[PDB]
Design a binder for this molecule. Structure first.
Ligand SMILES: *[C@H](C)[C@H]1/C(=C/c2[nH]c(/C=C3N=C(/C=C4\NC(=O)C(CC)=C4C)C(C)=C\3CCC(=O)O)c(CCC(=O)O)c2C)NC(=O)[C@@H]1C
Ligand SMILES: *[C@H](C)[C@H]1/C(=C/c2[nH]c(/C=C3N=C(/C=C4\NC(=O)C(CC)=C4C)C(C)=C\3CCC(=O)O)c(CCC(=O)O)c2C)NC(=O)[C@@H]1C
Ligand SMILES: *[C@H](C)[C@H]1/C(=C/c2[nH]c(/C=C3N=C(/C=C4\NC(=O)C(CC)=C4C)C(C)=C\3CCC(=O)O)c(CCC(=O)O)c2C)NC(=O)[C@@H]1C
Ligand SMILES: *[C@H](C)[C@H]1/C(=C/c2[nH]c(/C=C3N=C(/C=C4\NC(=O)C(CC)=C4C)C(C)=C\3CCC(=O)O)c(CCC(=O)O)c2C)NC(=O)[C@@H]1C
Ligand SMILES: *[C@H](C)[C@H]1/C(=C/c2[nH]c(/C=C3N=C(/C=C4\NC(=O)C(CC)=C4C)C(C)=C\3CCC(=O)O)c(CCC(=O)O)c2C)NC(=O)[C@@H]1C
Ligand SMILES: *[C@H](C)[C@H]1/C(=C/c2[nH]c(/C=C3N=C(/C=C4\NC(=O)C(CC)=C4C)C(C)=C\3CCC(=O)O)c(CCC(=O)O)c2C)NC(=O)[C@@H]1C
Ligand SMILES: *[C@H](C)[C@H]1/C(=C/c2[nH]c(/C=C3N=C(/C=C4\NC(=O)C(CC)=C4C)C(C)=C\3CCC(=O)O)c(CCC(=O)O)c2C)NC(=O)[C@@H]1C
Ligand SMILES: *[C@H](C)[C@H]1/C(=C/c2[nH]c(/C=C3N=C(/C=C4\NC(=O)C(CC)=C4C)C(C)=C\3CCC(=O)O)c(CCC(=O)O)c2C)NC(=O)[C@@H]1C
Ligand SMILES: *[C@H](C)[C@H]1/C(=C/c2[nH]c(/C=C3N=C(/C=C4\NC(=O)C(CC)=C4C)C(C)=C\3CCC(=O)O)c(CCC(=O)O)c2C)NC(=O)[C@@H]1C
Ligand SMILES: *[C@H](C)[C@H]1/C(=C/c2[nH]c(/C=C3N=C(/C=C4\NC(=O)C(CC)=C4C)C(C)=C\3CCC(=O)O)c(CCC(=O)O)c2C)NC(=O)[C@@H]1C
Lengths: 161, 197, 66, 160, 161, 161, 160, 161, 161, 161
């Protein structure tokens, strides 16, 4: 796991150099955007269940997937689906807070495509669901923070693909 | 009590690999004996009790061969992969003749659980070093997410036939030469030596 | 047949900066199957076994054990 | 099923099925025809069971059909009746199996979490299933109603 | 894990239809055969060790394998071999009782050939040994229950092969 | 745990003599009441939560104990109280089905009084509450089965007191 | 409180309070004046926050106060407003403490269990507390409202 | 663990009343002294090794206790003794920062008497030693802070006694 | 694990013969050489730290590997590298004492390739380092013992490569 | 095989959209940079032999690798080593011209790891050699083009390692 500051100092450490002026630039930019990140995290922490609720309704309900024989059918599999959406949203807020996508790759997207293929989960349908989450969470946090959430929701989508 | 709830949930996360709210009808664990009581004050007992339970059975004994049960069991309780074929054999004996309750009990009772994790620590992902094949095997076990595969990462430890035959190695070769040559040579402290062929 | 036990675990192996009272002195409910194995482990560790009680079960019961 | 439960327990303790478990599955095998007959009448009368039980449920819990309730509007009411139909189907499966294992595996594992994501009240779902039990018991004979009603009783107990 | 009844109801559950008359017919057939299944399981539970002993003597004894250097030689290896035969016979009775081979595939035949290859166990000789077990167990349980035991024993052989 | 049959057989086993004629009569009596026991267990399994809810409302609610400082105030303590009542009801039904109080002794009452005293639980209030449970459950199952149920609920009361 | 949580973490790792932790302790103590002022505002307006927000909750969720609902009748509705009163009190305690551990210790550990036992809808309780938060925004200045809002956010988030 | 704020709000919670102005006054008083508590904690954190060293030398050293057969003799025993003194001082500074004795009462004092009596550790000598620690730490922090610390040291002494 | 004696008797055991005169000659040779092995082990055990120090200095230091971003840079990785070198030397002397390389293949080189590839450790640099160890240890133990330590060190090199 | 243009249009194709204005901006950027790429390719194509010569001399020569038994010793292996270095440089400039690393992963690094492990080639020595190539080629093409050749050379290094 990394964040923006940790990534900057790690890169400088690899090249064996004190923090550059460009490295100081990146650190300043993260600090300037940091308070916005904190506020957005508070908002979607409060509305996490509601965001999942809306997204499930807006793409995953009243569809062939939730009807019998569509994987999301069965109460087990429905609970697993909504739990996975909560996983994605929680890790997206972690990534947004950190300012780095390393968390997503290291803890979420490693082996996730392989497991989904083995399970039979539709990778396309999960991607559609988390894009619906992206719309809902953008509305709640606001436009500026919604952009930041999007660059990590899309990262999760690309990993799933 | 705040920490106690965290540690109870953490035991679920390590033992069952995920939070158990999906995959259980009702919560089927009384943590009250562990919480403000001495009945399961030993987490060494709470973890074991969860291991005996039906939920562990349905999740990890019912669906996999005993070989995979052993690898998952050491991941779930000891934080590592099977050390060597010796542990594979011992735990297979136990799983063969006494079942899941005894196997989980053996893992948790093991001096390894006590020494590393201890009476009062939820077992954690351990990065072993000293056992030689253990670290690569352990990383392969832990990198897999739950229900990723039906394959056994540590199927069993294969014996190897050494390529380099001894009695060609330098020290024995010198000694073999000496014993042979000295035997053919004359023998000290003997009356008859010209008679021998 | 859970056994209620009271025991000590002094350890000369290391000096521990983190809390050790919890492990050092404790009372636990050990089932009948486990008690021999645990008794041997704690006795090997050298801790003094202060007290034993048969918390659950009866002192002698031919069948109908817990 | 009873057979798979016996095999699962025997496998967990690594011993062949005891004569008690073998006798258990033998008696279940003998009563299989009665079990299938009970399931047959339940599926024959599935429509009216769902319909009239749903009406009783709405009377019992007016807040459900009130504005703001989960089943407010004809569309939402239709989907709740669909859920009642699904649980009747699971009950017939469970009666045929002789165990609550299929019911649990299909519609009781995470039932609380699924419903909380939906926003639906689980105790009200339980009341609706109680109404279904009453209708089914009336349709069945006294001996048959005791068994099928017991399966409904497990479902409502899990809902609680 | 599945059985005949569970497989039938699961097949109908995927459709979402109630049990139709053909599904009822399959369930009736399993109920009709269940009584002989129970009797056979009780019979080989009584003779479990004897069945293993007879099969081992029939094919695995007085042969090179049990002679030195043959892989059943060494007391540990002999114990492991008879343990595996106990395993196979017990899982065969599980599958026969269930009326489905899902137990064999799930708990026996997955990762079994690879482990045997790594161990050096001869898959061919194991297949022969369980074939001998099949003969002995068929004689004890009777002919028709012998047909039922045979299909699952053959299933195990095919997985090993 | 000991059933009524288990206890009778155990007494005969301790004597070393086969089942006595009086022992047979005891076993017959338990078999006679067994079917009623099954019916009552099914009834209170279905209404378990309702029974607890009614009893809590009858004695434990809108009282000083639920008001602040009364040991049932605070969300966690209220949840503990209700689950204790469901524990009592569930073990009561186990004892009723068994026909003996051994389960209550071994799994419930031991250490219960001392731990309640250490925590500050009002034992008198709990005893009155489970008495209210006895009344409610007796109404549901019936008078005959309720009278049998009462002996085990009163056994719990005596152990608590 | 911040002080006790910092002490707890330092206790676990067996370290005397780090210089930065000491700075945080000092800062919280100094800004305690603002903390007390915010709590004083909330306790001054306990009546209208609960009353107005509860009425907004009833309007947003008519099913809770409908016949056959948890809040039907003036007696039950009085108890419902009492619950909202309790949660506002916990929020004021949390603002004074500077941490949410008092709120959690008192009234968020097991709310689902308690409310499900009562039959009350847990999402509806969350929406009522959301109403209290919205009412709080007008009463508190923008800078002050953000501080109190976070405690309200934790309560609703745990509730859901 | 409890502190001044937690104690005040806990008392109000038992009362079932919102924060009274008197309760606010108590909180204000704790805030008033929190400043001095912080700097005292910093001082003894830096000098903790010196404090333990000085107290051990003042009372524990050059005695029959650390001479052979005195239970402080043996390097392991000496390390354990100074470890306990480190524990006591660290918990004392925690209690001093909090303004409450709860941490001492629960985390330290309970069971300590039983362990010390069982092991044979002399509680009288430990009380004397922590008394010496109290004098040294009072000198380092200052008089006002020493008053704040000394009560918690005496609390530990009473628990040992 | 095997020894020279254990290997000889195990070969005779595989054939199924009591120890032949040729087998006895092998065993006698190992006994004759045992004292020389014990001497060499006594030497390098005393100088183990020096052997590692010299090898590290000769091949691993003042290069990019131990400067920022080099896999030996960072104190954690430097400690790990010297620990691996002591691992290699300790197991090499175990194999020398045994007179058999089965120790090395069973312990040292089981997946060591795979671990180093995963970790990013340069196999070639490790091989160079243990080559330097071989030079130093050969000089310490003498020519005849050195050519015995040499073969085991080269066996480790081949396993790594 | 892919280009920057081909990658952009393929991403838009996966989404199923005609080239968006953002996609057009990427394409326009690549067109703007194309001349610089063509220049750099013209430079290193002329100096390819010199780049290989300097890199070999700087890192691969006068060491054990190119002296008896070193994998570069023997004229056949020396020719193979310099041929591999020209392979790396040629594909690196292909990737630089394309503006995409898909060439390197599809061609250069498909099993290159496995081949070198089989052959006994030291991966670390190859990585050092192509690092030297990177230094020389960066100096020839200039800083801005060198940091473009640099990333592709480092991609090859990572694949080897
Ligand atoms: C019924 C008595 C109560 C009620 C229910 C209600 N449910 C929904 C929506 C869904 N219900 C399900 C249920 C299941 N899915 C399963 O796989 C199984 C097991 C086989 C069950 C029981 C699902 C998946 C949905 C989502 C919609 C869909 O199927 O796509 C609603 C609609 C909720 C909404 O606003 O969208 C309602 C209203 N409502 C009541 O009032 C009763 C108390
Ligand atoms: C919901 C949008 C879709 C869906 C999902 C679904 N997922 C599973 C099972 C699993 N999902 C995961 C994924 C994760 N595990 C993690 O730890 C994390 C975060 C680090 C993630 C993202 C895993 C491991 C499993 C398997 C283990 C398990 O059950 O948890 C299922 C269950 C499949 C089954 O039948 O066993 C389902 C149904 N289903 C849908 O229809 C949506 C498109
Ligand atoms: C001996 C004094 C007693 C006795 C023994 C008896 N043994 C067998 C058969 C076998 N014995 C073995 C033993 C071993 N296999 C090993 O690998 C090792 C270690 C190297 C040992 C000791 C084996 C494998 C067999 C099976 C036959 C075979 O070798 O192929 C028998 C024959 C059993 C039969 O009826 O078939 C007997 C009789 N019998 C006695 O009365 C003595 C007390
Ligand atoms: C007997 C017919 C043949 C034979 C067998 C033999 N097997 C092993 C070792 C193992 N066998 C298994 C297989 C299973 N494990 C299971 O849990 C199950 C049921 C679910 C099966 C079928 C496993 C895991 C092992 C290894 C672990 C262990 O020792 O149990 C050996 C031992 C090999 C060794 O030296 O380590 C042997 C000898 N040998 C024969 O000659 C027969 C042809
Ligand atoms: C109001 C927003 C919602 C609602 C609630 C409702 N609650 C009850 C009953 C009780 N509520 C409590 C709550 C608490 N106890 C605590 O210790 C704390 C933390 C300090 C809380 C919040 C308790 C104990 C009760 C039981 C009765 C009692 O106090 O003795 C009811 C009454 C239910 C009944 O039939 O008796 C209701 C209606 N109802 C709604 O509609 C709202 C959505
Ligand atoms: C409800 C009637 C009354 C009440 C109860 C209350 N109990 C506790 C804590 C505990 N309850 C138990 C009970 C059991 N544990 C079991 O395993 C079983 C099965 C037979 C039972 C019945 C135990 C052991 C404890 C202690 C462990 C723990 O703390 O969980 C509490 C919590 C006390 C606290 O301060 O946290 C409460 C409140 N309280 C009442 O007011 C009712 C009169
Ligand atoms: C010695 C070569 C160096 C040195 C030592 C020094 N030690 C002390 C004081 C003590 N030393 C001990 C040691 C032990 N106690 C044990 O139980 C054992 C094992 C059996 C040992 C080794 C103890 C207990 C003390 C405390 C005094 C006492 O014995 O009561 C001092 C005195 C320190 C002081 O100022 O008080 C010194 C100087 N000093 C050196 O310069 C040497 C390098
Ligand atoms: C020093 C002033 C005196 C002394 C001490 C001594 N103590 C022990 C052993 C233990 N001390 C404790 C106490 C604590 N454990 C804790 O975690 C905390 C903080 C909450 C305290 C205060 C415990 C648990 C032990 C036993 C376990 C352990 O070793 O830690 C010993 C060792 C006894 C032995 O031989 O095993 C000694 C010597 N000795 C003195 O002479 C002083 C008067
Ligand atoms: C200087 C204050 C003291 C001192 C040091 C000294 N160090 C070395 C050699 C090395 N030092 C390091 C240190 C690090 N490697 C790391 O990764 C990190 C963390 C970023 C550190 C601090 C290393 C790796 C070496 C090895 C040589 C190398 O870097 O290639 C020496 C040289 C030793 C020699 O004889 O070869 C010295 C002298 N010496 C002093 O006198 C000071 C007290
Ligand atoms: C001498 C007659 C002529 C000459 C040669 C010259 N060669 C080199 C450098 C190298 N030569 C080799 C040769 C071989 N490597 C092999 O594996 C084999 C087969 C066994 C041979 C013949 C190699 C590898 C090198 C590279 C350096 C090294 O070995 O490490 C040089 C040095 C070149 C330089 O500037 O670096 C020279 C000068 N030069 C003459 O003038 C003669 C006509």
């Amino acid at each position: 796991m990394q964040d923006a500051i940790t990534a900057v100092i790690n890169a400088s450490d690899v090249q064996g150099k004190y923090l550059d002026t460009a490295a100081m630039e990146k650190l300043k930019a993260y600090f300037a955007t940091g308070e916005l990140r904190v506020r957005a995290a508070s908002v979607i922490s409060a509305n996490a269940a509601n965001i999942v609720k809306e997204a499930v309704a807006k793409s995953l309900l009243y569809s062939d997937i939730t009807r019998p024989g569509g994987n999301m059918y069965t109460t087990r599999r429905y609970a697993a689906c909504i739990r996975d959406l909560d996983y994605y949203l929680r890790y997206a807020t972690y990534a947004m807070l950190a300012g780095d996508p390393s968390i997503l790759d290291e803890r979420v997207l490693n082996g996730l495509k392989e497991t989904y293929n083995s399970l039979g989960v539709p990778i396309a349908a999960t991607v559609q669901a988390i894009q619906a989450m992206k719309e809902v969470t953008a509305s709640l946090v606001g436009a500026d923070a919604g952009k930041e959430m999007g660059i990590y929701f899309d990262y999760i989508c690309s990993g799933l693909s | 009590k705040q920490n106690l709830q965290l540690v109870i949930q953490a035991a679920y996360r390590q033992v069952f690999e995920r939070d158990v709210a999906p995959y259980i009808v009702r919560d089927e664990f009384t943590a009250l004996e562990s919480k403000l009581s001495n009945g399961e004050i030993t987490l060494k007992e709470f973890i074991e009790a969860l291991g005996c339970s039906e939920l562990y059975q349905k999740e990890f004994y019912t669906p996999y061969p005993n070989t995979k049960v052993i690898e998952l069991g050491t991941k779930h309780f000891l934080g590592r992969a099977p050390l060597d074929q010796a542990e594979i054999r011992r735990y297979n004996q136990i799983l063969a003749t006494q079942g899941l309750k005894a196997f989980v009990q053996a893992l948790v009772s093991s001096a390894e659980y006590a020494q590393a994790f201890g009476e009062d620590t939820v077992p954690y992902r351990r990065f072993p070093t000293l056992p030689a094949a253990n670290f690569p095997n352990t990383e392969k076990l832990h990198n897999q997410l739950t229900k990723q595969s039906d394959a056994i990462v540590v199927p069993s430890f294969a014996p190897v036939k050494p390529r380099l035959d001894n009695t060609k190695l330098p020290l024995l070769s010198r000694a073999i030469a000496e014993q042979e040559a000295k035997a053919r040579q004359a023998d000290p402290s003997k009356p008859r030596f010209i008679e021998l062929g | 047949r859970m056994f209620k036990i009271t025991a000590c675990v002094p350890s000369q192996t290391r000096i521990r900066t983190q809390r050790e009272l919890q492990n050092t002195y404790f009372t636990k409910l050990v089932p009948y199957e486990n008690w021999f194995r645990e008794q041997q482990r704690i006795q090997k560790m050298g801790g003094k076994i202060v007290k034993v009680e048969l918390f659950t079960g009866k002192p002698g019961v031919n069948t109908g054990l817990a | 099923s009873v057979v798979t439960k016996s095999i699962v327990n025997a496998d967990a303790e690594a011993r062949y099925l005891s004569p008690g478990e073998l006798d258990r599955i033998k008696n279940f095998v003998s009563t299989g025809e009665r079990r299938l007959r009970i399931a047959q009448t339940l599926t024959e009368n599935r429509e009216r069971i769902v319909k009239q039980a749903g009406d009783q449920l709405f009377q019992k819990r007016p807040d459900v059909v009130s504005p703001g309730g989960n089943a407010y509007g004809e569309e939402m009411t239709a989907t709740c009746l669909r859920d009642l139909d699904y649980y009747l189907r699971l009950v017939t499966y469970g009666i045929v199996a002789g165990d609550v294992t299929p019911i649990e595996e299909i519609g009781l594992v995470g039932v609380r979490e699924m419903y909380n994501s939906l926003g639906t009240p689980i105790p009200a779902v339980a009341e609706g299933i109680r109404a279904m039990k009453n209708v089914a018991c009336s349709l069945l004979s006294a001996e048959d109603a005791a068994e099928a009603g017991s399966y409904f009783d497990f479902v409502i107990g899990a809902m609680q």
